RNA sequence: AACCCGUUUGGCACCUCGAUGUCGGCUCAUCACAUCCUGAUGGUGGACAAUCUAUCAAGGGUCCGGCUGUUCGCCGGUUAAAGUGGUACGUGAGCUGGGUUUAAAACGUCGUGAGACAGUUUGGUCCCUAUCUGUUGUAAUUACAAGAAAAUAAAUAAGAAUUAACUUUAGUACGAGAGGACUAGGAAAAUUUAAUCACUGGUUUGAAAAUUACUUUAAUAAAUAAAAGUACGGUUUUUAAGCUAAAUUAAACAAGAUAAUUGCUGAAUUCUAUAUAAGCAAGAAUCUAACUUAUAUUAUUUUCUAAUAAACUUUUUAAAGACUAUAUUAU
RNA sequence: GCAUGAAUGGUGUAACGACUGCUCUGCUGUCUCCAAUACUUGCUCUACGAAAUUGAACUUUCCGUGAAGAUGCGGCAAUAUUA
RNA sequence: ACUCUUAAAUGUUGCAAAAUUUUGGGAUAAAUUGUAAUUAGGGGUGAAAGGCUUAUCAAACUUAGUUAUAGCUGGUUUUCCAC
RNA sequence: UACCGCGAGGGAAAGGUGAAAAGAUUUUAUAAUAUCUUAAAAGAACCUGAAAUUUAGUGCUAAAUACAGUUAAAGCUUUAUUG
């Protein structure tokens, strides 16, 4: 076991420090639901009062 | 330097008070008749204080017969010989000394039976302490003995004379190589970049032979250093 | 304690034990050295191979006890075989030039150097046998001279 | 500091205050340590003397940067970056003022293989009632089959002393400066000639707020400084602090 | 220093001569009772036909002592005998007369002024 | 005694690598930059024996 | 070391003795002694007692003290004084002793009960 | 009436019959919570106070003494309280042996008789040098990163004394009155614990004074004087230095998360409801963080290093100490 | 008088007791509360050198397990090695 | 002194197969003791306890019947093949 | 027989040189081993000389794991590798 667990590495950040390998892109975006409750997003000719 | 009993050290020796003070008086009456005893290391090192006081109160008696001192003299000595011995035979031999009358020196060997340390008291101007010192003198002068302090001074002095002529051959070779390499060859036909590595590396040779010439001379002062001198600190 | 040591070094290593058992041994190595002289060897080259031990005989008796009991006490003897080998002179210097000379070989060389009042020049020559620090140079100088050649190949 | 010994002095109101003496012997900074590089914000210091023939070579270069002499001990003190000091700065008894309460570290005295009674104040067994060879013994170490073993941190004999300890909440009574001493109203761990490592009290910043000057005592220019200094006695007399009349049984 | 089963010698003029302790006040556990501390008392010896008869369960303060009564300066005081004051309800001794001195280390202003003098 | 004074927790929860800040994978990378010009007397000649990044990595890449 | 501690204890003794309202006389055991010992400095009430000095301790140092025995309100009593203390206000000798006597007597508390007339009279031998 | 626990009285007869065990007491402990007090809270036929009941809660604490062989129990007195129990009804290779189960003897009763008793009474012997586990302490050898001399952090664990008169708020609120608070604070003392030895007290085979009997140094020249031994260190008394307690000094509040429990708005259940389902807030002597001490588990900084960094052996001494190790010291 | 009783002798009795039971004064480290000291023993080196015992042995905690109370089986774990 | 051994501690593979140390009983008498001798196995002797009788006593020691008996415990020696 | 027991009486241990003493010369702070005698030293409690026990020499060798072994894989090895 110990020989195996000697070969494991953990990080808190979104990176690893190794080089020559890839990194997961983080997902920071957050969906703007603005098109549902806002006329300023739409064009005025599509709308109606 | 013991905090317990007034700064002094104490040896129980498996003996209580009266059983110990009989040991003192016997050894001290023996330490004047024969003026040399071979014992263990602790019996030889338990008795130095009692004796160093024992002789003052004999030396005082010679100069000034004092009731206070002769009373000390009757207590620790049993016989009448030993009482009359040191006042006239010992105390006349010492000649106005107060400080230290007595030596204690240990031994490298141990007994055959018990394998115990050993050591001997001697009153300081004993005959055997003089005879033994004449032999060491005579053999070192004339016989089978090295006389190291000549061999040591010899070797640092052959060394000192040997470093200098390597220093002399350095200042020469620096100059001859410098004047050649700075004058004739800066005209061309060289790399002047390495010109720093010429002097910079050669001068280190001088510094080497010069830094070692400190060690040897310090190794000679220290061989000719009197007791009543200071300490000589050294570069590094 | 005495294994892979020079023979005269063993006695030095052995007088510091302060026992009967020590002295019983040194009477045996001093025998074996006497045989080697008799056999025309170079005692300056005489290392140790093995000191072998074994029981010989037991003499019983009685050690009494309380309440009529008794035990059996055995005084006993032993045997001491000793073996030595003189290294060839060539193998003795395969070691020194690496820096593993026996101290006893230097104690003699130091004691020789003083009896005849030697000079400074004789010491710089014989400094690779003469002290530990001087014998640490030789283990280091020697590591440098091989490496100069290792680099002479590594270029290619 | 180097402890020296003890005294005791009568205060204004007659009370005999025990006092413990400490001598700062050339306490001097050696190295500043910052969190960025060195991992922590702290100092170390150096006190005492050492002859030039017991000194080691790397100790020299460790000292010789900031141009300071050799020492006999070296210890750290966590501090804040606001309250750093320079290197080579020498510290004085003026760093403390009498009235504030002080912490101490140090090593205790040494008794040896202390017996069982001496080490935990066990009770004896009853001598002279048919007792057979267990007068000072501990007695039972444990129970039978369950648990079936002796537990840990259990009370037994052993080396008592030479233990690193602290003693909180100790006053500073007075100061001398020309003879760089400090006097403390109480006891400290260790026979004299023993190091002692003192600091302000974590346990109370309230009481000592008056008596506290950061980072340490600057002298101030063109002013007359006192070489010796005490604190103010209590406002009340111990001989006059009486018991209340109704503090009575029935 | 006072313990259970100490014989005492009161000074209040109630006819009592010698007297014993069997309880100590001031906490759950007391193994000792120093000055200005209370005790209970049985009576053992009296003037005859006394209105304080034998075997009466009383309270008391103890006043003096034979041990070193410390003072703050380092000095200390020491008597030849222990002395007590037998009590009704509170600090209200039986005999109106007190008959003797006191140590100042008991610290009760009204209770001291009743006496001759205190060291 | 060590044998008897121990604590029988698992190593995994005693382990020093794990901290409040993070896991201590190997070590810190250290920039061994040395001023090879402002040297002392007895180390001037042997300046070539000192580590220098811009030279050594040139050599590995040269030999490699 | 400790010697540094003593030289502070000596200067401070001198600072007091040269400042006290009175001076120290040369008295011995066997000599009578008065003194006004206080109870508090806020209120200078005290007591004056005549008594027979049984011992002296640490004379000519900072913890100097002595012992007396006297009879206060008809009650024999013992007290141990710190000589250089502030609570003393007076110190006086009434009757002198005479002759060879021991430095520390102690047989007036232990091994004996005393009267007035033995305490107001010094040791006198011819 | 439905389940639980395994502390009592018992049923069975699975382990041990090829050296041992019974109750109680001294010393020493550890665990549970189904909590005696302290701490928090709901309810009340709860005005205040005192008290009753239930829940959450194991941090620390939980008496001396008389009679008895005695746990128990009665009694005297007290306290914040004098908890219920388990651990081969904890603890006999750690102590005792009083009770009870051997031999002697006596009374009573039964028995022709030897003798017997879930009756009494006086007396009354088992031992041990600790191989391993376990534990309190102490070191050695070795490993890690180039090698070495020093200083620290980080991480985990262990540890931490409880109570409160009296007093201020306040004789206020409450109350016909008697009486008498919540809240927020200060705080003597007792018990326990740690560090220390300037003072005090004890100790003193270390130092000294006085002194009795016999003997002796050494004395059939005397006299004076000194000195030694033996008699518990001869006895009594004083005392340096150290150790020591009877002595000295002193032993935090707050903050964060939560347990029973308190609350804001507001639906399901068309509500001036509901502390919850989205969501926003409180709540303890506990737990955490912090503080203290220790540690071959990982890591950092400083400085030096072979034409010379280091360490080990030996001596002296100790304030350190079984040995060692640490400290100190010599060349 | 559960189940006393007259030569298995009944009742009482000054003196004597290394006899059994209770009480008092004095005394005191038995105890509150234990401390310091001397020698011996002990620990270190050295010479000599026993005893009962012992399947083998590289000999760990807890719960569970089970010929019914586990160092040795099971299950999560502990220990650089030894004195 | 001598003789006996009440009480405690020590010791328990001890100095000792019943002692050491301290204490204690009797001490002109029913006393203590030396030398040599008698009494002998269901008998001896016994100020009686089932004690003593060469460290052995609800019936000695030695030899012999005798290789006592045992429905009891403990043990029963090399290999392969079948039921 | 020795030893034990006051006594009757009980009651062990213990073999081997070589054909022939030719029983070991000489060197050596002192050869078990060269040399000499002899077929060989089989070297004096001396034929052969097992096992338990035990020492040394050369190999691989640890740092967690255990009725102390088995089956399998990988690694290093004395010309002893047959570990
Ligand atoms: Mg001894
Ligand atoms: Mg004597
Ligand atoms: Mg044997
Ligand atoms: Mg010590
Ligand atoms: Mg105590
Ligand atoms: Mg007790
Ligand atoms: Mg016994
Ligand atoms: Mg005893
Ligand atoms: Mg179990
Ligand atoms: Mg267990
Ligand atoms: Mg004086
Ligand atoms: Mg006194
Ligand atoms: Mg059965
Ligand atoms: Mg069973
Ligand atoms: Mg059977
Ligand atoms: Mg069995
Ligand atoms: Mg609960
Ligand atoms: Mg509890
Ligand atoms: Mg807590
Ligand atoms: Mg009674
Ligand atoms: Mg009783
Ligand atoms: Mg009650
Ligand atoms: Mg049992
Ligand atoms: Mg039990
Ligand atoms: Mg047991
Ligand atoms: Mg009948
Ligand atoms: Mg009796
Ligand atoms: Mg062991
Ligand atoms: Mg075991
Ligand atoms: Mg303490
Ligand atoms: Mg003291
Ligand atoms: Mg004293
Ligand atoms: Mg004395
Ligand atoms: Mg005399
Ligand atoms: Mg005599
Ligand atoms: Mg003292
Ligand atoms: Mg909160
Ligand atoms: Mg609603
Ligand atoms: Mg609502
Ligand atoms: Mg009848
Ligand atoms: Mg009858
Ligand atoms: Mg009739
Ligand atoms: Mg009869
Ligand atoms: Mg009759
Ligand atoms: Mg009658
Ligand atoms: Mg009668
Ligand atoms: Mg009798
Ligand atoms: Mg009766
Ligand atoms: Mg105590
Ligand atoms: Mg193991
Ligand atoms: Mg189990
Ligand atoms: Mg299985
Ligand atoms: Mg298992
Ligand atoms: Mg007698
Ligand atoms: Mg009598
Ligand atoms: Mg009589
Ligand atoms: Mg009978
Ligand atoms: Mg018999
Ligand atoms: Mg028969
Ligand atoms: Mg037949
Ligand atoms: Mg039959
Ligand atoms: Mg031939
Ligand atoms: Mg031949
Ligand atoms: Mg043979």
Written as one string, the DSSP assignment of D113-138 is: EE-HHHHH-PPPP-SSSS--S-SS--
Answer yes or no: is D126 CB < 7 A from strand I. Answer: yes
Nearest nucleotide to A1 (CA to C1') is: K64
Using CB atoms within 10 Å of the CB of residue D14, give its burial: 0 to 12 exposed, 13 to 18 middle, 19+ buried: buried
What resolution (Å)? 3.7
DSSP codes of every residue in A1-49: -HHHHTT----SSS--S-SSS--PPP-------TTTS-GGGS-TTT---
Q: Is the CB of C68 under 7 A from strand J?
A: yes
Q: Quick check: D130 CB within 7 A of strand J?
A: yes
Give backbone dihedrals phi and psi of D100, rounded to 5 degrees, phi first. Answer: -90, 155
Report the b/e string of A25-40 with b at 16+ CB within 10 A.
eeeeeeeeeeeeeeee
Which of F41, F42, F45 has its CB closest to that of B201? Answer: F45
Which residues of B fall within a CB distance of 8 Å from F44?
200, 204
**Element (H or E) spanning E5, and its range?**
none
Residue C34: how many other CB atoms lie within 10 Å: 11
The whole-angstrom separation of Cα G87 and Cα E75 is 10
Q: In whole angstroms, what is the distance from residue B76 CA to residue B68 CA?
A: 14
DSSP sequence for chain C: --SSSBHHHHHHHHGGG-SHHHHHHHHHHHHHHHHHHHTT--TTS-EEEEEEEEEEEEE---EE-STT-EE---EEEEEEEEEEEPPPHHHHHHHHTTT---HHHHHHHHHHHHHTT--SHHHHHT-TTT-HHHHHHHHHHHHHHHHHHHHHHHT-
- Please name the nucleotide lying closest to B5, CA to C1': H241
Q: Using an 8 Å Cβ cutoff, are D32 and D40 in contact?
A: no
Torsion sign, CA atoms D224, D229, D235, D239: negative
Q: Is there a contact between G80 and E119 if contact means CB atoms under 8 Å apart?
A: no
Interface test with F, best of B194, B200, B202, B204 (most F CBs within 10 A): B204
Select the residue of B110, B115, B151 nearest C117 (Cβ to Cβ). B151
Which residues of F are less than 8 Å from A11 in CB distance? 22-23, 25
* Closest Cα in chain D to G8: D7
Q: In Å, what is the separation between the CA of C129 and the C1' of K77? A: 35
Q: In whole angstroms, give the CA distance from residue D33 to residue G98.
A: 74
Does any strand J atom come closer than 7 Å to the Cβ of D248? no
Q: Tally DSSP H helices, then E strands, for chain D.
A: 3, 12
- Cβ of residue D132 lies below 7 Å from strand J: yes
Structure tokens at B123: 């009153």
Closest CA relative to residue D163, chosen from D217, D107, D202, D91: D107
Q: Do F42 and B200 touch (CB under 8 A)?
A: no
Nearest to B158 among C18, C115, C120 (CB): C120
Please report how the helices B17-33 and B67-76 are oriented relative to each other, as an axis angle in degrees rounded to 10. Answer: 100
* E5-27 b/e (C-beta count within 10 Å ≥ 16 → b): ebebebbbebbbeebbbeebeee
Residue in C33, C38, C35 with CA at minimum distance from that of residue C11: C33
- 8 A C-beta contact, residue D148 and residue D67: no
User: What six digits make up the tokens of D202?
Assistant: 């974590």
Residues near G78 by beta carbon (within 8 Å), at least 6 away in sequence: E77, E78, E79, G67, G68, G69, G109
**Chain E residues 23-82 with CB within 8 Å of chain G:** 68, 73-80
Tokens of E31: 């193994």
- Nearest chain G CA: its distance from D21 CA (Å): 8
The residue of chain B nearest to residue C116, with distances taken between CA atoms, is B146
Say which residues have a Cβ less than 8 Å from residue C131's Cβ, sequence separation at least 6. Answer: C106
CA D12 to chain centre: 26
Q: Is F4 helix (H, G, I), strand (E, B) or coil?
A: helix
Residue ranges of D 164-203 with Cβ closer than 8 A to chain G: 176, 179, 192-193
E116 touches E83 (CB < 8 A):
no
Q: Which residues of D are annotated as a binding site?
A: 110, 135, 146
Q: With an 8 Å Cβ cutoff, are F25 and A12 in contact?
A: no
- For residues G73 and E116, is the Cβ–Cβ distance under 8 A? yes
Residues 6+ apart with CB under 8 A from A16: A9, A23
Q: Round to whole Å and give the CA distance between G66 and B23.
A: 42
Alpha carbon dihedral E107, E109, E111, E117, in 10-degree steps, equals 90
Minimum-distance ligand to the CA of F3? 50
DSSP symbol at E119: -
Tell me, yes or no, whether chains D and G touch by having 3 or more C-beta pairs under 8 A.
yes
Whether D227 and D176 have beta carbons less than 8 Å apart is answered as: yes
Taking the C-alpha atoms of residue G113 and residue E80, their distance in angstroms, rounded to an integer, is: 9
Beta strands in B116-209 (DSSP E): 119-123
Cβ-count burial of B150 within 10 angstroms (0-12 exposed, 13-18 middle, 19+ buried)? exposed
Query: What are the chain E neighbours of G46 within 8 Å (beta carbons)?
Result: none
Q: What's the CA-to-centroid distance between D146 and ligand 13, angstroms?
A: 25
Minimum-distance nucleotide, CA of C50 to C1': K56
- Kindly state the tokens that stand for A32: 């703007």
Give D131 CA → H117 C1' in Å: 37
Residues 46-65 of chain C within 7 A of strand J, judged by CB, are 64-65
> Phi, psi at residue E9, to the nearest 5°?
-135, 90
Contact G69, G105 (CB under 8 A): no
**What are C113's two structure tokens?**
């150097």
The distance of D162 to chain G (nearest Cα, Å) reads: 21
């Amino acid at each position: 076991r110990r020989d195996l667990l000697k070969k494991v590495e953990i990080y808190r950040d979104f990176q690893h420090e190794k080089q020559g390998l890839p990194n997961f892109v983080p997902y920071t975006e957050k969906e703007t639901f603005d098109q549902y409750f806002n006329p300023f997003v739409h064009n005025f000719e599509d709308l109606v009062i | 330097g013991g905090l317990a009993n007034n700064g002094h050290k104490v040896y129980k020796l498996g003996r209580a008070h009266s059983q110990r003070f009989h040991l003192i008086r016997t050894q001290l009456t023996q330490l004047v008749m024969h003026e040399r005893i071979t014992t263990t290391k602790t019996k030889c090192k338990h008795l130095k204080p009692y004796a160093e006081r024992l002789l003052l109160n004999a030396m005082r008696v010679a100069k000034t017969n004092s009731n206070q001192s002769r009373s000390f003299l009757q207590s620790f000595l049993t016989t009448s010989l030993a009482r009359r011995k040191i006042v006239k035979e010992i105390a006349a031999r010492l000649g106005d000394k107060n400080n230290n009358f007595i030596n204690v020196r240990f031994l490298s060997e141990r007994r055959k039976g018990d394998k115990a340390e050993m050591g001997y008291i001697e009153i300081k101007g004993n005959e055997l302490e003089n005879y033994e010192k004449s032999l060491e003198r005579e053999q070192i002068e004339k016989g089978e003995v090295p006389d190291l302090k000549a061999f040591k001074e010899k070797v640092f002095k052959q060394e000192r004379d040997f470093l200098a002529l390597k220093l002399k051959e350095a200042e020469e070779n620096i100059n001859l190589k410098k004047l050649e390499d700075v004058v004739l060859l800066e005209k061309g036909k060289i790399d002047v970049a390495e010109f720093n590595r010429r002097e910079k590396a050669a001068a280190a040779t001088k510094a080497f032979f010069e830094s070692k010439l400190k060690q040897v001379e310090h190794d000679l002062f220290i061989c000719n250093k009197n007791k009543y001198d200071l300490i000589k600190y050294v570069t590094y | 304690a005495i294994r892979k040591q020079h023979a005269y070094d063993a006695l030095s290593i052995l007088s510091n034990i302060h026992s009967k058992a020590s002295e019983q041994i040194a009477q045996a190595i001093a025998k074996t050295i006497s045989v080697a002289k008799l056999k025309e060897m170079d005692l300056n080259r005489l290392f140790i191979h093995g000191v072998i031990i074994g029981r010989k005989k037991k003499r019983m008796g009685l050690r009494y006890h309380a309440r009529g009991r008794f035990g059996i006490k055995h005084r006993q003897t032993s045997t001491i075989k000793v073996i030595l080998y003189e290294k060839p002179v060539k193998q003795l210097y395969r070691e020194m030039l690496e820096g593993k000379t026996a101290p006893v070989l230097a104690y003699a060389m130091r004691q020789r150097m003083v009896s005849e009042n030697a000079d400074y020049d004789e010491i710089r020559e014989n400094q690779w046998v003469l002290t530990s620090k001087g014998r640490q140079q030789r283990k280091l100088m020697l590591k440098r001279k091989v490496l100069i050649q290792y680099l002479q190949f590594k270029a290619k | 500091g180097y402890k020296l010994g003890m005294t005791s002095i009568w205060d204004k109101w007659g009370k005999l205050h025990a006092l413990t003496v400490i001598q700062i012997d050339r306490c001097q900074v050696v190295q500043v340590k910052t969190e960025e590089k060195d991992g922590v914000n702290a100092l170390q210091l150096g006190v005492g003397e050492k002859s030039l023939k017991r000194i080691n070579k790397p100790t020299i270069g460790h000292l010789m940067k900031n141009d300071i002499p050799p020492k006999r001990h070296l210890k750290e003190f966590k501090v804040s970056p606001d309250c750093f000091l320079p290197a080579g700065y020498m510290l004085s008894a003026r760093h403390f003022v009498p009235g504030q309460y002080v912490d101490i570290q140090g090593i205790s005295v040494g008794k040896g293989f202390a017996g069982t009674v001496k080490r935990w104040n066990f009770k004896m067994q009853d001598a002279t009632h048919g007792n057979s060879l267990s007068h000072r013994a501990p007695g039972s170490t444990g129970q039978r089959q369950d648990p079936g073993r002796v537990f840990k941190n259990k009370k037994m004999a052993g080396h008592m002393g030479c233990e690193k300890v602290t003693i909180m909440d100790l006053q500073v009574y007075k100061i001398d400066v020309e003879r760089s001493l400090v006097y403390i109203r109480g006891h400290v761990p260790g026979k004299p000639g023993s190091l002692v490592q003192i600091r302000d009290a974590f346990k109370k910043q309230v009481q000592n707020e008056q008596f506290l000057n950061f980072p340490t005592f600057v002298a101030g220019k063109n002013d007359k400084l006192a070489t010796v200094l005490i604190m103010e006695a209590s406002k009340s007399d111990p001989n006059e602090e009486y018991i209340h009349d109704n503090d009575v049984v029935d | 220093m006072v313990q259970k089963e100490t014989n005492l010698k009161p000074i209040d003029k109630c006819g009592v001569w010698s007297v014993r302790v069997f309880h100590l006040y001031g906490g759950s556990f007391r193994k000792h009772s120093y000055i200005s501390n209370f005790v209970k008392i049985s009576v053992k010896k009296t003037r005859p036909n006394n209105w304080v008869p034998k075997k009466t369960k009383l309270k008391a303060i103890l006043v003096t002592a034979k041990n070193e009564l410390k003072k703050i300066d380092g000095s200390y005081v020491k008597f030849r005998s222990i002395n007590t004051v037998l009590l009704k309800k509170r600090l209200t001794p039986k005999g109106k007369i007190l008959m003797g001195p006191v140590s100042v280390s008991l610290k009760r202003k009204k209770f001291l002024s009743s006496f001759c003098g205190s060291i | 005694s060590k044998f008897s004074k121990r604590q029988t927790t698992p190593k995994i929860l005693r382990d020093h690598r794990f901290t409040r800040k993070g896991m201590v994978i190997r070590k810190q990378s250290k920039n061994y930059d040395y001023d090879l010009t402002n040297l002392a007397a007895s180390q001037a000649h042997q300046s070539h024996l000192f580590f220098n990044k811009e030279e050594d990595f040139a050599l590995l890449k040269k030999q490699a | 070391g400790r010697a540094l501690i003593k030289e502070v204890e000596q200067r401070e003794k001198l600072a007091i003795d040269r400042q006290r309202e009175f001076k120290i006389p040369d008295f011995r055991a066997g000599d009578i002694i008065q003194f006004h010992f206080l109870k508090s400095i806020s209120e200078g009430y005290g007591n004056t007692v005549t008594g027979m000095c049984t011992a002296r301790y640490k004379n000519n140092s900072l913890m100097a003290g002595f012992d007396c025995v006297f009879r206060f309100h008809g009650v024999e009593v013992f007290m141990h004084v710190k000589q250089n203390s502030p609570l003393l206000v007076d110190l006086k000798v009434v009757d002198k002793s005479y002759g060879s006597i021991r430095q520390k007597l102690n047989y007036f508390w232990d091994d004996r009960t005393n009267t007035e007339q033995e305490l107001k009279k010094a040791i006198v031998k011819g």
